[PDB]
Design a protein around this ligand. Structure first.
Ligand SMILES: [Mg+2]
Length: 266
């Protein structure tokens, strides 16, 4: 009946120490060994997801990475990218100048590396540690990055980000969307980013229907895929509206909610 499992990372697949438990790992490997295909779907850049995808052997079972909230869709076996929703190049110098003017660090991603002019900013390092990515520091951001980029973050104290966010929101209306993922991360992303939309494209391409999909998540950015999936699963630690929109509520991420759901459902 079900042929695909889509998982968010933080608050879902990973526990409170941001690790994949051995029970989750073994359950997901086994279910792939049974012919079920996995998708990791997360706001993280691709190389923040790659280590977890490698730990789950997804490169051996045709698993997909939906990085940047589905901004990119990559088959982690074949390495083929089927979908690339990136920032318009012309907005990048505007984002840079806004960060500079407001004395805040900007970062973006270039493969396995985070590129920034401020590697000593604790908020930049928070993103590097979260993704397990090395930081490449430059003194000429616009020269040293490789375009196009899927997103940028401006980072800093919440009180300093709110006005920058409020300015960019309208100044680049029509070119980008802006939101805060943590109080100190301002996400600068292309329009039309939604995990559910990217999932629908994936399903069209591999010839599956939404009824054949399980999607598991915890936060508001997982609501659309939980509704879209035939079997939407809310983690025990999920936000109340995610739980109410789900078809099934499992245990928390620290109680191996993902493994428990998969074993019960199958
Ligand atoms: Mg989450």
């Amino acid at each position: 009946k079900y042929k695909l499992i889509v998982l968010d990372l933080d608050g879902t697949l990973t526990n409170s120490k941001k690790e994949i438990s051995s029970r989750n790992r073994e359950t997901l490997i086994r279910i792939q060994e049974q012919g079920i295909r996995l998708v990791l779907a997360s706001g993280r850049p691709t190389y923040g997801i790659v280590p977890l995808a490698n730990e789950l052997r997804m490169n051996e079972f045709g698993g997909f990475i939906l990085s940047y909230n589905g901004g990119e869709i990559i088959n982690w076996e074949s390495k083929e990218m089927m979908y690339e929703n990136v920032l318009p190049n012309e907005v990048v110098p505007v984002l840079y100048e806004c960060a500079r003017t407001n004395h805040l660090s900007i970062l973006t991603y270039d493969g396995a590396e985070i590129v920034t002019e401020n590697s000593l900013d604790p908020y930049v390092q928070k993103e590097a540690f979260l993704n397990k990515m090395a930081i490449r520091e430059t003194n000429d951001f616009l020269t040293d990055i490789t375009l196009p980029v899927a997103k940028c973050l401006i980072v800093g104290d919440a009180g300093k980000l709110i006005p920058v966010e409020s300015e960019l929101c309208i100044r680049l209306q029509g070119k980008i969307n802006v939101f805060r993922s943590e109080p100190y991360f301002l996400e600068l992303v292309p329009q039309g980013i939604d995990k559910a939309l990217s999932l629908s494209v994936l399903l069209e391409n591999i010839g599956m229907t939404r009824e054949e999909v399980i999607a598991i998540g915890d936060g508001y950015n997982d609501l659309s895929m939980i509704k879209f999936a035939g079997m939407g699963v809310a983690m025990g630690n999920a936000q109340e509206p995610v739980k109410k929109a789900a078809d099934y509520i499992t245990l928390t991420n620290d109680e191996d909610g993902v493994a428990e759901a998969i074993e019960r459902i199958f």
